Write a protein that binds this ligand. Structure first.
Ligand SMILES: [Cu+]
Ligand SMILES: [Zn+2]
Length: 153
């Protein structure tokens, strides 16, 4: 779409308004956001499968993997569909996201509308930890907050 949002929220007051703009069927998306309630430091950020509560928190399915690759980040050879590596939280526990991608579509085959955008405690290990868990998740640990990607309104 040309205006999508994902309101992150967790067990605690950790919350974050993510924004996504695509417009173009096959153009570079802009993705950005601003958490409020993480700790400082790097936090893994990914599009988990779908709004699947049974996966643990309010919703957080496995790392979405349509092409069935190993985990990593935008700069890796092995990166899943929604492997937006990690973001950096401030000393005030705010991680201002601002990146762009061309794998997804927000409106098309890879409509991210409906997906489950989740933040992790630890840094994404860029799926290089040489262990399934890491090479599937980034060893980023438990999901401080979870959320769903929808239309901005
Ligand atoms: Cu994740
Ligand atoms: Zn991944």
């Amino acid at each position: 779409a040309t205006k999508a949002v994902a309101v992150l929220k967790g067990d605690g007051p950790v919350q974050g308004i993510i924004n996504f703009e695509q417009k173009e069927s096959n153009g570079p998306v802009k993705v950005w956001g601003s958490i409020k309630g993480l700790t400082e430091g790097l936090h893994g950020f990914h599009v988990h499968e779908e709004e699947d509560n049974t996966a643990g928190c309010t919703s957080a399915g496995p790392h979405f993997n349509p092409l069935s690759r190993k985990h990593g980040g935008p700069k890796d050879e092995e990166r899943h569909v929604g492997d937006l590596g990690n973001v950096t939280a401030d000393k005030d526990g705010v991680a201002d996201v601002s990146i762009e991608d061309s794998v997804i579509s927000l409106s098309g085959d890879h409509s991210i509308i409906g997906r489950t955008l989740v933040v992790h405690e630890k840094a994404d290990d860029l799926g290089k930890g040489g262990n399934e868990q890491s090479t599937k998740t980034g060893n980023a640990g438990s999901r401080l907050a979870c959320g769903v990607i929808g239309i901005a309104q």
